[PDB]
Design a protein around this ligand. Structure first.
Ligand SMILES: C[C@H](O)COCC(COC[C@@H](C)O)(COC[C@@H](C)O)COC[C@@H](C)O
Ligand SMILES: CSC[C@H]1O[C@@H](n2cnc3c(N)ncnc32)[C@H](O)[C@@H]1O
Lengths: 277, 280
């Protein structure tokens, strides 16, 4: 292998590249994808899938805190949480910081991502042994189609077409009253058209769907987004005081002001959405 | 076409496919004008991305609107740096601005930006704009008390011609030069890629001015793409009081910035809040 640290580049559309100098600790192809475990100088250990940046030890909280804490502070209850994806273990770690959470089911199609993340990325996945976590290797899409009505308080998609309308309708069916759906919603910079289409799809399925915005330096443009959906309008703005007071002292980024801030929409998003109303 | 990279401490790189249109070394710095497939025509200084036609509003709207919406008066504005023209374009959107002084050390930056980056610098012809090729640090040392409503520092990283722009004596002269109710703003690097500098800037400016508050936004061509600016003034909380008449004239003319974006950008991550406490 390489004597010294190499440039590990994610190339976007053959015309942008973002790279981190680091060592390859392990690379294999699973039946689903190429998995590359790396040791970066700037961010520590991390993960690519099909030569795209997924995570790293010191650029992960910015993804995981934004996916998890806005839904978990606002859902009427948080006893039962479903994560679709979650392979690196950072989403379930954030979800398990809340004492009210009773069960988290993680459903990840590629068992090699979980094994390799548990073996090398333990500094990100600190909650694998939490007796509330149940890890299932299988298709996340089939799981929500096959799950009971009103069985989960929160549904988090931690992965990325196969997330179509029928999938999101199952999500609404499987959510309990007062419950929250959330997922990544691509870049308003690098994937605007898909960004807007996802907002429109979730707005047609749920009573309210709101995008929110933050930073992932290793994703295309570094300008990333999420989508919150519930069947109560204005729920996204009303985190529970007691959940905020408990979570704020345990996280690196998220607080009551970041929570309100992230939902401010840039004029170009507001305009792209009103063009289609 | 070739990869044009900004390399960040031999650890991180950000590249755009494109072509080199012009390169020279001035008495101050290496100037690179490029065309890029992804963001059109841009500017590197000493191999650091400064600007591009389709990646520039995220920087220029953030530097300019929060101070211009909030200063008690905006008749006289001083811009230090800003050779590419985008900062003064944003400033000159306001009807109540009467004069904008742009003090740029490197005349070649203004000339190459006028020749090649006219699509960013759309306001060079504004009669209210006076371009002065000189050092910003010397300019505010010389300027009289209470002579400007707004000072914007549109400079680069702390290493080379932009270095003195991060020092306490410069910040003291800026607070001296500002009129009552006026506003200072600077780019303040990245809380991901330059956390120690970002927090030192917050601390030094917080000491000089009654209040200084970081604010956060996006610049995909800058290291991490997670960027920041510093608001400072002699009125605590002035950053939360943007004027409705200024917002209603500006919002229709800008791609990102609005009332909600203005208030959101000041939300501080826990690790910035705690990092300022570790500093004490
Ligand atoms: C919100 C922003 O426009 C406020 O202006 C600040 C300010 C108003 O004074 C405060 C008031 C009497 O309690 C004070 O700035 C004082 C600093 C600079 O020491 C300035 O307004 C003064 C103009 C109208 O000359
Ligand atoms: C893309 S524009 C960034 C700008 O900051 C300018 N600059 C850096 N240091 C100073 C200084 N001390 N005085 C005036 N302009 C500066 C650079 O020459 C450039 O136009």
């Amino acid at each position: 292998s390489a004597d010294a640290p190499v440039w590990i580049d994610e190339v976007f559309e053959d015309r942008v590249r973002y790279g981190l100098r680091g060592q390859i600790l392990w690379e294999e192809t699973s039946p689903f994808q190429k998995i590359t475990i790396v040791d970066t100088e700037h961010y520590g250990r991390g993960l690519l899938l099909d030569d795209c940046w997924m995570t790293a030890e010191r650029c992960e909280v910015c993804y995981h805190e934004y996916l998890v804490h806005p839904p978990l502070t606002t859902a009427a209850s948080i006893a039962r949480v479903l994560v679709i994806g979650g392979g690196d273990g950072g989403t379930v770690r954030e979800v398990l910081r809340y004492a009210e959470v009773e069960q988290v089911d993680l459903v990840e199609i590629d068992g090699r991502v979980v094994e390799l993340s548990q073996e090398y990325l333990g500094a990100i996945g600190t909650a694998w042994a939490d007796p509330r976590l149940n890890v299932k290797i299988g298709d996340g899409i089939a799981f929500v189609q096959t799950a009971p009505d009103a069985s989960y308080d929160v549904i988090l998609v931690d992965g990325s077409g196969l997330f179509n309308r029928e999938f999101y309708e199952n999500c609404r069916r499987v959510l309990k009253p007062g419950g929250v759906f959330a997922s990544q919603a691509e870049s308003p910079d690098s994937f605007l058209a898909v960004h807007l289409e996802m907002i429109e799809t979730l707005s047609a399925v749920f009573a309210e769907a709101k995008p929110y915005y933050g930073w992932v330096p290793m994703y295309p443009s570094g300008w990333w987004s999420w989508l919150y959906a519930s069947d109560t309008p204005g729920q996204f703005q009303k985190p529970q005081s007691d959940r905020l007071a408990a979570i704020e002292p345990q996280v690196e980024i998220y607080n009551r002001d970041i929570h309100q801030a992230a939902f401010a929409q840039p004029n170009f998003v507001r305009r792209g959405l009103s063009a289609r109303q």
